[PDB]
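Hi both,

Apologies for the delay on this - the queue was longer than expected. I finally got the 2-acetamido-2-deoxy-beta-D-glucopyranose-bound model through. Below you'll find the protein sequence and the ligand SMILES exactly as submitted, and right after that the C-alpha cells for the full complex including the ligand.
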Amino acid sequence: KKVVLGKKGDTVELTCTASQKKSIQFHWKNSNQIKILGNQGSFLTKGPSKLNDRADSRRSLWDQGNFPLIIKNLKIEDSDTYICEVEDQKEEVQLLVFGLTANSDTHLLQGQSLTLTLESPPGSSPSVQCRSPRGKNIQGGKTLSVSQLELQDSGTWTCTVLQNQKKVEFKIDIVVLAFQK
Amino acid sequence: DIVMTQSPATLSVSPGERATLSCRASESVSSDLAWYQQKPGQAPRLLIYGASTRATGVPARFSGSGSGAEFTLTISSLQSEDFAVYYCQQYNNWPPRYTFGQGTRLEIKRTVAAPSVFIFPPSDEQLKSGTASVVCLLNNFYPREAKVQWKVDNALQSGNSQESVTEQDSKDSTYSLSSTLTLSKADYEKHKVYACEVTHQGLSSPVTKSFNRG
Amino acid sequence: EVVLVNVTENFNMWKNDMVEQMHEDIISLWDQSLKPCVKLTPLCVGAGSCNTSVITQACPKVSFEPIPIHYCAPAGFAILKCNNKTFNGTGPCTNVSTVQCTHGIRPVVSTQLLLNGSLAEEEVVIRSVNFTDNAKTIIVQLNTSVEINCTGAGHCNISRAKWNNTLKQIASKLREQFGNNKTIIFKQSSGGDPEIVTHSFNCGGEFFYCNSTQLFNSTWFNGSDTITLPCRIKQIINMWQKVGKAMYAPPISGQIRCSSNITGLLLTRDGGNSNNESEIFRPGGGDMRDNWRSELYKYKVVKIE
Amino acid sequence: EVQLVESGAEVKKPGSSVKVSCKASGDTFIRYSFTWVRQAPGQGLEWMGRIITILDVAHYAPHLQGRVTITADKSTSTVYLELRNLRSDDTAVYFCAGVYEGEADEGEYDNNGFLKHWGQGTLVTVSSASTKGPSVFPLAPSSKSTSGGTAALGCLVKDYFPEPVTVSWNSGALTSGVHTFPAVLQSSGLYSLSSVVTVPSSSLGTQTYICNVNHKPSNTKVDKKVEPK
Ligand SMILES: *[C@@H]1O[C@H](CO[C@@H]2O[C@@H](C)[C@@H](O)[C@@H](O)[C@@H]2O)[C@@H](O)[C@H](O)[C@H]1NC(C)=O
Ligand SMILES: *[C@@H]1O[C@H](CO[C@@H]2O[C@@H](C)[C@@H](O)[C@@H](O)[C@@H]2O)[C@@H](O)[C@H](O)[C@H]1NC(C)=O
Ligand SMILES: *[C@@H]1O[C@H](CO)[C@@H](O)[C@H](O)[C@H]1NC(C)=O
Ligand SMILES: *[C@@H]1O[C@H](CO)[C@@H](O)[C@H](O)[C@H]1NC(C)=O
Ligand SMILES: *[C@@H]1O[C@H](CO)[C@@H](O)[C@H](O)[C@H]1NC(C)=O
Ligand SMILES: *[C@@H]1O[C@H](CO)[C@@H](O)[C@H](O)[C@H]1NC(C)=O
Ligand SMILES: *[C@@H]1O[C@H](CO)[C@@H](O)[C@H](O)[C@H]1NC(C)=O
Ligand SMILES: *[C@@H]1O[C@H](CO)[C@@H](O)[C@H](O)[C@H]1NC(C)=O
Ligand SMILES: *[C@@H]1O[C@H](CO)[C@@H](O)[C@H](O)[C@H]1NC(C)=O
Ligand SMILES: *[C@@H]1O[C@H](CO)[C@@H](O)[C@H](O)[C@H]1NC(C)=O
Ligand SMILES: *[C@@H]1O[C@H](CO)[C@@H](O)[C@H](O)[C@H]1NC(C)=O
Ligand SMILES: *[C@H]1O[C@H](CO)[C@@H](O)[C@H](O)[C@H]1NC(C)=O
Ligand SMILES: *[C@H]1O[C@H](CO)[C@@H](O)[C@H](O)[C@H]1NC(C)=O
Ligand SMILES: *[C@H]1O[C@H](CO)[C@@H](O)[C@H](O)[C@H]1NC(C)=O
C-alpha cells in the first residue's frame, strides 16, 4: 500500500522497482483495469487511458529496474489507484490531486476578505491550513476565509493539505494595497 | 585528411565579364561541396551546396558544377557586389571532419595606375615619447602588388618596418598602402636622410620620397 | 530428419528457451549488418545524473537480406516438435516427434504485422499467455497470406478486399475466444513510440514507419480496390535491441520497393471495465521475441541422454 | 529562417579558457545542426566542429580534439563553444553557423554539412598584453616639399590593445578620400595603424582637419587636429 499526493497542473512521478537491474516487461493500469502505460521490448506503449498524452515514463532507468509512471500537468480526475504489474507483481498506489485557489484577484485592499478554495477528488476529506506572511493562520475543510485583510498580509502565503496523514505545499501570492492619509 | 585547394589565389576580372573559380580535393568527395562568398568584415554567405544547387537568394549568374576532386564556380557576369573572397568546403566524410579551401580573392581588374607617394617624418610629440615612427603612403594605385624599400643615409633597411593595405576601393578600384618604419628617439637622431623608395608597374622608374632629419 | 514419437509431451511457447536464443542471435545478425552513423544508449549507474554512451561509426549503405536460419540441437539436447496442425503453445502435445533442425525461419524485425512467416494449416489461430490479461500480446496467425507492397516513395499498398476477408476471419476467431454475442472493433494503436504506433520495418536497408489506421478501423458482427498507407522513412529511430537510439544516413536510391506477405498480426485488446458486449483490438508489437515466438511456438529444446 | 546572434568580444590571457554563445531564434531549434567556424586575422575559414542538436551529439576537428567542446541548451535555443588552454594562435573571429536538417522531431535528418545561417561572429583575442588606449600622432601635410594641388595628411594610432579602434574625420563630416589602414601587430604585442586623407592643398590654412580616434576597450576617445606646420 502507498498514498501519493500531487499538485494540480504539476508533475507527479510514481515509481516501480523490480528485483534485478534488468529491463523487464511492465505496465500500469488504473482501478478499472485500463491500460495507461507499459513497455514492449525497448519500446514504450500508451493505452486507451484518459491520461494518454499526459502520461510517460523514463526508459533511462529501465536497465536499472525502475519503470516509473510520470503523470504531468495534473488534473484532479487523475486521482485514483494505479497498479504497476511487473515480473508477476502488483505495486499498487493511490493518487490524490489537489488544487487551491484564491477566489479573488490578489490586488485587494486593507479590510477586504481572502477566500481560498481547495479542489479535492470525491471521497477524500483533507485538512487545509495556510500561513500568511505575517503569521495569520487559518484552518479549514474545503474553503478558508480571512474576513479582513491587513497590509502585513501582502506577500506569499503557504498552504498545507493533510490527507491520509500526508501533505503538500501551496505557495499563493497575494497583494494587499497600501494607501495614504 | 581531406585537403581542399582553390586554384587562383586571386582572380582579376573586368566588370561585367565572367569569372571561373577552381577548387580541387586531395581525395574524392562526391558532390558534398559548397561554395561561400565573403565580403570584408562580414560572415560568410552560402552560394552553392551539393556542388550545384544554388542557395536561396543567390542570383542565377552564380552556378556550380563538378564532382569528385575537381569543382568549378562560375559567375556569368560580374556585378559590383560580386567582388569578394570565395571559399569551398567539402562535407563528405564521416565522422564529420569537414574542411575549407584557402579561398580565392576575386578582384576588380582595371587599367594600371601609379601611386602618389608621400613620406611623413615622426611628429615632435612622438619624438617626445622616446620613439620615432616614419610613415610612407603609396596612394591610389593598381595593381595591388608593390615593393617598398626604406633607405636611411643610403642604407637599405629591413626588420623595422610594417606594411598595411586597404581593401580595393569601391569607387575607383585602386589600392593604397602604408609602410611604417620604427626606431627609438636614439637611432633616429643619429642619421640624416630618410627615404621611401617605391616600385610599381605604373612607374617608369622607382620613385623615392625622402626628408632630412631636421 | 523426423521421428514420430509415441508419448505425451508438454509445450509452452511463452517460456521457450529457443526464443531467447533466436533473439540474441538476430540482434547479432543486425549489429554486424545494419550499422548506424551513431547510436545512443542510456547509462544511469546510480550516481547523480545520467551518462549517455555514444558511438560514432562508419555508416555504409547496405540492406538487410538475411538467409533463412535453421536451428538444430545444441550440444547435449534434442529438438521436439508438436506435429499437431493446430496447437496453441501452452498445453500438452499428443502427436509429437524428434527433429534434427527447425524448418527454415526467415527472421524479420517489424511491428504489428508479421511478414514472410509460416501460415496456419487449418483455420486462423490466435495465441496469448492470458487472453484475460488485456496487457498481454495476442499473436494472430493467418492461414492465408496477404501481399503488402511498399515503396520509398511514401506508401504501402494492400487489397481492400483480401485484408477485409482476413479481418472477418480474425473477429470470427476472436468473438469465439471471448463472447459469441460480443462485437469486435479494430481501432488504431493507443500510442507510444513511433516504431510501435506504426507498422514499422526495414526495406532496402531503410526504416519504414507506415500509418496503419486504415487497416484497423472496423466493427464486426453488429471505387473500392486498394488501400494505400502513408509511410515515412526515418533516419533517427528507437532501437529494438535495447533501450537506445540510432541515426542512419539518408537514402541513396530513388527506387526502393519491397513486397511481403502479411502472415500474422500482433494484437492487444483494450480490457478495462468496458462492461459492454464488445472488445476492442489494436495493432501491438515491439518485443521481437513475440515475432520469434510466432514461428517457434511448435518446438522445444530437450536435454537428451 | 533562424537568426544567429553571437555573444560579445572576448579578451583572454594565454592559458585561459573561453565560452562563446550563439542565440538562435525564428524556427524550431532542434531542427537544425550547428557548427562553429573560426578565422584568424588575414586568413581563411577553419572548420572547428559540429553538433547535432537533436541527438545532443557533437564532432570536432582533429587538431582541435581535446580542448574544445560544443554544447546546446534546448531551453534557451543557445549554442555554446568552449575552448580550453587558450593559445595566442587561437586569436580569431569565431563564427557560429547553422543549417536545417528536416523534422528531427519526427526522425527525419538529412545530416546536412553546408552552412546556411551565420552569426555576426565573435572576436576572441588571446594575448599576454594588457588593455590600453592608443597614442595619437599627426601626419602633418606634405606642404613642405611635394609640388602639386592635393596634399596628404592623417593620424598615426600607435601602441593600443586590443582591437578594434574606429576612426573618423571632422566628427564624420569628412569621409571622401579617407584611407584608414588595417591594424598591424607590432613585436611589442600592441596594435598600430594610420588613417589618412588627401585634401586640396588650398584647403590648408583655412580648413581644419581633425581625426577622431575611439577605442571602446580602454574607454579612450581622442581627437587630434593636424596643422600644416
Ligand atoms: C504487389 O505486387 C503483386 C505482384 O508483384 C509481384 O512481384 C513484383 C516484384 C514483380 O516481380 C511482379 O511481376 C510480381 O507479380 C500484386 O499481385 C499485388 O496486387 C501488389 N500489391 C497490391 C497493390 O495489392
Ligand atoms: C458500450 O459503451 C459503454 C462503455 O464504453 C464506453 O463508451 C463511451 C461512454 C466511451 O466514452 C468510453 O467511456 C467507453 O468506451 C457502455 O456503457 C455501453 O452500454 C456500451 N454500448 C453502447 C451504448 O455503445
Ligand atoms: C560517464 O559515465 C561513467 C559511468 O557512470 C563515468 O565513470 C564517467 O566518468 C562518465 N564520463 C566519462 C568519462 O565518459
Ligand atoms: C491450447 O491451450 C489450452 C489452454 O489450456 C489447452 O487446454 C490446450 O491443451 C492447448 N492446446 C490445444 C489442445 O489446442
Ligand atoms: C482458414 O482458411 C480456410 C481456407 O484456407 C477457411 O475456410 C477458414 O475459415 C480459415 N479459418 C477460419 C475458420 O477463420
Ligand atoms: C491471467 O489473467 C488474469 C486477468 O488479467 C490475471 O490473473 C493475470 O493477468 C494472469 N494470471 C494468470 C491467472 O495466469
Ligand atoms: C468486405 O467487403 C467490403 C469491401 O469490399 C466491406 O465493405 C465489408 O465490410 C466486408 N464484408 C464482409 C463482412 O465480408
Ligand atoms: C495517420 O496516422 C496519424 C498518426 O499516426 C493519425 O493522426 C492519422 O489519423 C492517420 N491518418 C490516416 C492515414 O488514416
Ligand atoms: C475508419 O476506417 C476507414 C477505413 O475503412 C478509414 O478510411 C477512416 O479514416 C476511419 N475513420 C474515419 C471515418 O475517419
Ligand atoms: C508471398 O509473397 C510473395 C512476394 O513477396 C508473393 O509473390 C507470393 O504470391 C506470396 N505467396 C502466396 C501466399 O501466394
Ligand atoms: C520476404 O520479406 C522480405 C522483407 O523482409 C522481402 O524483401 C522479400 O521479397 C520476401 N521474400 C519473398 C518471398 O520474396
Ligand atoms: C502409445 O500408443 C500406442 C498405441 O498403439 C501404444 O502401443 C504404446 O504403448 C503407447 N506408448 C506410450 C505413449 O506410452
Ligand atoms: C491438437 O488438436 C488435435 C485435434 O485436431 C488434438 O487431438 C490434440 O490433442 C491437440 N494438441 C495436441 C497434439 O496435443
Ligand atoms: C501424428 O500421429 C497421428 C495419430 O497417430 C496421425 O494422425 C498424424 O498423421 C501424425 N502426424 C504426422 C504425420 O507426424
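Main takeaway for now: Helices of chain C lie at 17-31, 160-177, 194-197, 288-296.

I'll put the files on the shared drive as well.

H.
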